[PDB]
Scaffold this motif. Structure first.
Motif, mmCIF file in Angstrom:
data_model
loop_
_atom_site.group_PDB
_atom_site.id
_atom_site.type_symbol
_atom_site.label_atom_id
_atom_site.label_comp_id
_atom_site.label_asym_id
_atom_site.label_seq_id
_atom_site.Cartn_x
_atom_site.Cartn_y
_atom_site.Cartn_z
ATOM 1 N N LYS A 22 0.827 -1.196 0.000
ATOM 2 C CA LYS A 22 0.000 0.000 0.000
ATOM 3 C C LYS A 22 0.866 1.253 0.000
ATOM 4 O O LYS A 22 0.614 2.202 -0.749
ATOM 5 C CB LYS A 22 -0.912 -0.043 1.220
ATOM 6 C CG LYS A 22 -1.859 1.119 1.374
ATOM 7 C CD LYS A 22 -1.255 2.202 2.247
ATOM 8 C CE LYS A 22 -1.157 1.766 3.698
ATOM 9 N NZ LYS A 22 -0.582 2.833 4.550
ATOM 10 N N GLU A 26 1.936 4.733 -2.725
ATOM 11 C CA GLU A 26 1.726 6.011 -2.054
ATOM 12 C C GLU A 26 2.945 6.901 -2.227
ATOM 13 O O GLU A 26 2.829 8.080 -2.581
ATOM 14 C CB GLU A 26 1.430 5.787 -0.570
ATOM 15 C CG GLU A 26 0.005 5.367 -0.271
ATOM 16 C CD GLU A 26 -0.217 5.080 1.201
ATOM 17 O OE1 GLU A 26 0.748 4.676 1.882
ATOM 18 O OE2 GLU A 26 -1.355 5.268 1.680
ATOM 19 N N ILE A 30 3.432 9.777 -5.063
ATOM 20 C CA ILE A 30 3.834 11.072 -4.525
ATOM 21 C C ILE A 30 5.003 11.623 -5.325
ATOM 22 O O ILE A 30 5.014 12.799 -5.708
ATOM 23 C CB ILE A 30 4.172 10.952 -3.029
ATOM 24 C CG1 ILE A 30 2.886 10.994 -2.204
ATOM 25 C CG2 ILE A 30 5.117 12.067 -2.601
ATOM 26 C CD1 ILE A 30 3.047 10.496 -0.785
ATOM 27 N N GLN A 33 3.855 12.943 -8.376
ATOM 28 C CA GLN A 33 3.173 14.226 -8.240
ATOM 29 C C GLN A 33 4.144 15.401 -8.262
ATOM 30 O O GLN A 33 3.784 16.488 -8.725
ATOM 31 C CB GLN A 33 2.361 14.255 -6.946
ATOM 32 C CG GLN A 33 0.965 13.679 -7.082
ATOM 33 C CD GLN A 33 0.959 12.165 -7.088
ATOM 34 O OE1 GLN A 33 1.092 11.532 -6.041
ATOM 35 N NE2 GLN A 33 0.820 11.576 -8.269
ATOM 36 N N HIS A 44 8.819 24.920 -2.040
ATOM 37 C CA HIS A 44 7.859 24.108 -1.296
ATOM 38 C C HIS A 44 8.261 22.643 -1.264
ATOM 39 O O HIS A 44 7.961 21.942 -0.290
ATOM 40 C CB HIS A 44 6.451 24.220 -1.873
ATOM 41 C CG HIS A 44 5.434 23.454 -1.083
ATOM 42 N ND1 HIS A 44 4.783 22.346 -1.581
ATOM 43 C CD2 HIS A 44 4.992 23.609 0.188
ATOM 44 C CE1 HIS A 44 3.966 21.867 -0.661
ATOM 45 N NE2 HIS A 44 4.073 22.616 0.422
ATOM 46 N N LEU A 48 7.364 19.167 0.882
ATOM 47 C CA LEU A 48 7.050 17.893 0.253
ATOM 48 C C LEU A 48 8.135 16.873 0.561
ATOM 49 O O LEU A 48 7.842 15.722 0.905
ATOM 50 C CB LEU A 48 6.901 18.078 -1.254
ATOM 51 C CG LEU A 48 5.836 19.089 -1.681
ATOM 52 C CD1 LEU A 48 5.915 19.342 -3.179
ATOM 53 C CD2 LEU A 48 4.445 18.614 -1.283
ATOM 54 N N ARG A 51 7.408 15.966 3.957
ATOM 55 C CA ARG A 51 6.378 14.931 3.976
ATOM 56 C C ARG A 51 6.946 13.607 3.481
ATOM 57 O O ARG A 51 6.629 12.538 4.015
ATOM 58 C CB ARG A 51 5.160 15.334 3.150
ATOM 59 C CG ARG A 51 4.078 14.244 3.213
ATOM 60 C CD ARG A 51 2.752 14.624 2.585
ATOM 61 N NE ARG A 51 1.823 13.500 2.641
ATOM 62 C CZ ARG A 51 1.067 13.187 3.686
ATOM 63 N NH1 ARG A 51 1.122 13.875 4.815
ATOM 64 N NH2 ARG A 51 0.244 12.145 3.601
#
Lengths: 51, 51
Positions: A22, A26, A30, A33, A44, A48, A51
């Motif tokens: 899973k 993810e 990401i 993205q 930024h 990220l 994160r």
């Protein structure tokens, strides 16, 4: 009971597996993205990256 | 005596259980909660970048 806990340990892995599999997309998504053929500036991305 | 025991179920395609229902329930309910865990972080991912 020794046998039972053996089997409990077994699923804990599959419990592990489910987590990573899973997670695997993810993170991969990401990454998908953040950037591509057109680009994302950096400042930024710090967060990220955080994160 | 039986409630001690793990007993068998053929779910939808008929895949084979030998189970307590509480196990059965938990794997069912656990399936939901895992998604909530997954959705929350996934949502979190969308939020930060979207923000």
């Amino acid at each position: 009971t020794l046998d039972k806990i053996q089997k409990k340990v077994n699923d804990d892995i599959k419990n592990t597996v489910d987590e990573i599999n899973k997670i695997g997309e993810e993170i991969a998504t990401i990454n998908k993205q953040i950037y591509g053929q057109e680009a994302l500036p950096t400042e930024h991305a710090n967060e990220l990256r955080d994160r | 005596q039986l409630q001690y025991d793990k007993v068998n179920f053929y779910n939808e395609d008929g895949t084979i259980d030998n189970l307590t229902m509480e196990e059965y329930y938990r794997k069912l309910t656990g399936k939901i909660a895992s998604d909530g865990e997954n959705n929350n972080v996934v949502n979190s991912s969308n939020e930060t970048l979207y923000n």
